[PDB]
Amino acid sequence: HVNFYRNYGKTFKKPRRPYEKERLDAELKLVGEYGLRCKRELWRVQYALSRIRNAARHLLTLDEKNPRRIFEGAALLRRMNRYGLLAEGQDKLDYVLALTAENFLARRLQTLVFKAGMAKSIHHARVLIRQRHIRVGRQIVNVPSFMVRVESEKHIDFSLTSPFGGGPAGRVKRKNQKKAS
Template identity: 90%
Template sequence: MSTVLGVAAPLNHGKYLDLPFLIELRLVGEYGLRCKRELWRVQYALSRIRNAARDLLTLDEKNPRRIFEGEALLRRMNRYGLLDESQNKLDYVLALTVENFLERRLQTLVFKTGMAKSIHHARVLIRQRHIVGRQVVNIPSFMVRVDSQKHIDFSLTSPFGGGRPGRVKRKNQRAAAKKAAGGDGDDEEDE
């Protein structure tokens, strides 16, 4: 320990932070997050939910506030698919992890359903407005509800969803049409 103006400061900065750093880095890579701030946002939301559940668990079983707010919290967790219907106690809310939340993101669900080649490709498809629920969503961190999960599909205007073909495919179609019409197709004329 060295002291500067009477304040003790550790000499070896950051050694004890090595394990949380590696855990965060693994989650960022596994779920295709842009930066650690996205992970920290999820951690903060989880801590708020767990604090609310912990606060409600301190109240009496018959307390109207515990009954009303506890049911609302459990209903919200069930709606987002974070808890099963059979898990209807506040103790299960305390057992939630960051991974449970990250599994319900639109980006993860697009990748898990096989619509994207990788988790990063899923993020690109969402940002480029190819993915649609009942409406087009271009936010990769969108939390998908259980009843909305079946509506995840390609947009009708997307080349992936049978819409207008992309630039390269249109160029290849023009070249094939020119070749079929009797042209040799060697001369590249852009129109």
């Protein structure tokens, strides 16, 4: 039975010590600031960040002039600079350890919407993403964790079909107008 062979794995790991005021408050801080649906969402980011940091660490164990090191470091910094997670002149493979979950929650399309305006609230931003309202280039993205890249940031905008800036109004508008006329 092929369709058996399709891989799939996990995206997070629950924290070891379930109940600590300090970690629990730090998690509530991040979930409050970046308007998350639950702390599974926070917990994915640390998993991805831990994977990349471990990738960096294994490289930094080796020495320069090692072809693996040059290639994978170049690739890793390309990946980060494409998502706007490391800045200019900061292409060093040591500032890729210093990145923290602030930086990944900084790129979720909720955050990009709210910081581009167009939301008036970050919790408004999440829902506005989910009611098919914002495209990226020409496709609507209804995922609050879309991780918009820098060569895509310049042109997040409303739909051609959403009521706010696209075409037809919503069903409540059309109800109000139909019972007004």
